[PDB]
């Protein structure tokens, strides 16, 4: 069923990954443009078809959706994150709280919590 759903959307399995996951985001930073361009077009077509309650024509459905094209970059991203974790986040650091638009409890983006509005 999963293979059929991917084929109907015209997308690959790795396209389905949500970039709200931080490993996926860090991998998508370093994918080559050729992979990136085709990944966007497939995801765009999938959302159009899903929104309009349509399915990809069968003429275009004869492909293997489980090709792991993101694997090299997922592994690189995990390696980069593990280094940062081990070399820069080995202790619960103390910082001045609610200053510069950040809670001081660790997040790095300003105005990214309710109490930091």
């Amino acid at each position: 069923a999963l293979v059929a759903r991917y084929r109907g959307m015209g997308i690959m399995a790795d396209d389905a990954m949500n970039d709200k996951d931080m490993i996926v985001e860090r991998a998508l930073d370093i994918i080559p443009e050729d992979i990136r361009i085709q990944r966007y077009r497939r995801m765009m077509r999938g959302a159009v078809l899903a929104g309009r309650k349509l399915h990809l024509p069968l003429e275009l459905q004869n492909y293997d959706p489980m090709v792991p094209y993101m694997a090299p970059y997922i592994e690189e991203a995990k390696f980069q994150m593990q280094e940062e974790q081990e070399l820069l986040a080995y202790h619960p650091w103390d910082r001045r709280l609610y200053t510069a638009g950040v809670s001081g409890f660790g997040e790095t983006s300003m105005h990214s919590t309710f109490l930091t509005m």
Partner: protein
């Protein structure tokens, strides 16, 4: 605030691929406002002195008072339908995996709603509400002296009503504040789509999503108007129109339909506290269903077989609650509770590698 409104209503971008199940939330907000307004207006003609006669005086003497009385009762049923359907949706599309903050804010409103409703039916001074608060207050009978502090007497009396009424008046306004915290996280943490990924297909809200959201709300209004004026569905038990007699026990001390899933839990388990505790589990375990997972996936858009069996478990437990405490229903209901735990365990457990 006009710029805030423009940023959150007029220039707010949402994916164009969302279904009508993404309109449920708009309906909750609108029906919630209606319940506050009608409540404040009813209180203009009734207070806590004697609700039984007060409800009679509203429906018979006040001009168009019947509208206020039946809207406030039926719109509660509606609030709980839309909320419970909003949760079923969020479970199906697993909208708690990456937007847990939104899920947490919602659960807070669910907790508040469960207290607002219970106490409103004692304001009617009816038999089934008198004897249903007398049976739920006696679940905290273990904590020493706490029942007396809450009740204000050794038996439920006008004193108990005068205080719960203030909680019923004020707690809804706080709920509206938590609704802002909820819409705040939704707007920052972008909404989930019918597709698992994120796509550049967003369109402004006022010109498109609000027109569609109104088509939805007007559809529900047609149906709610029919119930409001013709009682097509029995959503209020008739035994709440019997004057309170503290000597005679009602034929059946059951809650309203939207507390029958936690009433059954309490009538099925053999120890009173075990029941209370399994009612905590139901409202608490559902807040950690993605915490122990370890794979880069949101478990979304599969066949959702586990989800279907959970939604049916809820419906089946509500049925057992309507039924009297017959032994055969108790045995079958205990199996349904065991099954819920196993289904919940399946959501919680991470997977080993072949």
């Amino acid at each position: 605030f006009i710029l805030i409104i423009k940023d959150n209503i007029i220039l707010y971008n949402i994916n164009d691929s969302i279904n009508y199940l993404w309109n449920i939330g708009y309906i909750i907000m609108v029906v919630m406002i209606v319940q506050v307004i009608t409540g404040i207006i009813i209180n203009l003609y009734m207070n806590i002195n004697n609700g039984y006669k007060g409800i009679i005086y509203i429906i018979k003497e006040i001009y168009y008072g019947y509208i206020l009385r039946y809207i406030h009762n039926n719109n509660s049923t509606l609030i709980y339908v839309v909320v419970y359907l909003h949760i079923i949706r969020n479970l199906y599309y697993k909208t708690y995996y990456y937007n847990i903050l939104i899920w947490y804010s919602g659960m807070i409103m669910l907790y508040q709603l469960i207290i607002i409703g219970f106490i409103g039916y004692i304001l009617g001074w009816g038999q089934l509400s008198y004897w249903g608060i007398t049976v739920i207050i006696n679940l905290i009978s273990g904590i020493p002296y706490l029942i007396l502090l809450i009740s204000g007497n050794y038996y439920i009396t006008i004193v108990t009503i005068k205080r719960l009424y203030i909680v019923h008046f004020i707690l809804p306004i706080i709920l509206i504040y938590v609704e802002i915290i909820h819409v705040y996280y939704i707007h920052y943490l972008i909404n989930n789509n019918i597709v698992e990924y994120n796509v550049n297909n967003k369109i402004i809200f006022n010109n498109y999503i609000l027109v569609k959201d109104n088509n939805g709300i007007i559809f529900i209004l047609n149906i709610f108007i029919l119930e409001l004026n013709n009682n097509i569905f029995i959503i209020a038990d008739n035994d709440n129109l019997i004057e309170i007699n503290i000597l005679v026990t009602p034929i059946h001390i059951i809650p309203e339909w939207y507390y029958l899933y936690w009433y059954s839990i309490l009538k099925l388990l053999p120890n009173k506290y075990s029941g209370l505790y399994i009612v905590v589990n139901s409202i608490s375990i559902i807040n950690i269903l993605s915490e122990y997972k370890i794979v880069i996936s949101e478990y979304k858009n599969y066949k959702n077989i586990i989800w279907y069996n959970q939604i049916i478990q809820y419906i089946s437990m509500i049925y057992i609650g309507i039924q009297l405490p017959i032994i055969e229903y108790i045995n079958y209901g205990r199996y349904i509770i065991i099954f819920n735990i196993l289904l919940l365990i399946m959501y919680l457990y991470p997977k080993k590698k072949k």
